[model samples]
Target: MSDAGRKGFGEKASEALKPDSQKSYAEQGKEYITDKADKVAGKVQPEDNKGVFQGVHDSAEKGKDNAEGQGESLADQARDYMGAAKSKLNDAVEYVSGRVHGEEDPTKK
Candidate 1:
């Protein structure tokens, strides 16, 4: 079920995947650096929080960190479909939900 769900989700968002290789050089570079920044963000979490993890912990945490980074990249990829409109809508929704729940915005996501 989960496997099929992933395939379905991929097809649903596949519009962005269609022309992915044709991005302008500058725009592609920007996302490349930003993607790297996401990885850095994961690794640079405050020392106290990740410090508790010994060698094994660091390995597992790094694995999850890269996983998170890839997910963020996927979000950017999806934006190619409705870049402006979807971004605005997402911002509004995330803002409202964040305020209502008294939680950090999905900006962190």
Candidate 2:
């Protein structure tokens, strides 16, 4: 098989093995990063009594850091899918943050 054919076969196999595998290219690019961010957020425990807002702030900070790390990983990949992955990941981050923060305008400005 040609390289393109082999790659397509591998992609199909990967998608079959993990239903969300294609979504890794579709929706979850930033989700993949944010999941890591949430993991980091889980580690934070503030001593003050600022309440849920503080916790959310901490989590958001951690999540941003995690996303940056994941972005770096995406950047390291080859130029083909990595470019798409980075674009999708960036969109995911902005979308989630806007939704969470109740921002009226969510397109990266």
Candidate 3:
């Protein structure tokens, strides 16, 4: 059986994935370095934290630390599973009341 697999991104975002410098490159610092580098090299504008790209970078910077930790935490994964359960239950509730899935309630599966 021939099958395509993984899409090259199936690994969990764990801290042990790479060396410190390379991991920083994957998660965040590369952007900082690249922005400053290009500006210094006359390839792009300097980081003023005002432009749309800068704002996107800043927003990503805010999420990086939190996201990296969450990515490594089993508690976070469990909470996400619980959230999915709640959402599926709500879908069942909607189906019970409004025939959301028409004749086949997925909860029966």
Candidate 4:
């Protein structure tokens, strides 16, 4: 009936919590992971398993560069197709023009 018990209020750290320096076991586990990630996002170095993280960094960098290369490549492909269409249309026009002039073969004229 009385809200007076301090079962969890200001109690000394428990046995399970005694291993780490005042931090609970769960806190140490989670904080460790956060520390590794925080250092990488802006720091001058990669975390443990440095080569593995380095691979990821390299992949992302190259992926960005690759996209720009692909942009120009795709643009070039489109330009080539446009020129091909124009060339093909010119041939059709030439065929009609040749018959109107009574030429047996268009290239001869």
Against the reference, the lDDT scores of all candidates come to: 0.40, 0.43, 0.43, 0.43
Question: For residue 70, what is the lDDT in candidate 3?
Answer: 47
Off by over 4 Å in 1: 1-82, 103-109
Across 1-109, the per-residue lDDT of candidate 4 in tens digits comes to 7767555658676666445446445432111111111111222433334434344443233123332224646888677677786786666555544344442322322
Listed per candidate, the RMSD to the true structure in angstroms reads 26.3, 25.6, 31.0, 29.5
lDDT of 3 by residue, 1-84 (tens): 897677565677657565655433444311111111111111233345444543253222322234222445767767777878
Tell me the tens digit of each residue's lDDT in model 1 across 38-70: 111124343345444455323324433332224
What does the lDDT come to for candidate 4? 0.43
Worst 10 residues of 1 by lDDT: 30-39
Residue 107 of model 4: what lDDT? Answer: 31
TM, every model? 0.19, 0.23, 0.21, 0.23
Q: List the residue pairs that clash in candidate 2.
A: none
* TM-score winner, 2 or 3: 2
Question: Which pairs in model 3 have colliding backbones?
Answer: none
Cα-lDDT of candidate 1 = 0.40
Give candidate 4 misplaced runs (Cα > 4 Å): 1-74, 102-109
* Candidate 2 TM-score, C-alpha based: 0.23
Q: Which window of ten consecutive residues has the lowest lDDT sum in model 3?
A: 30-39
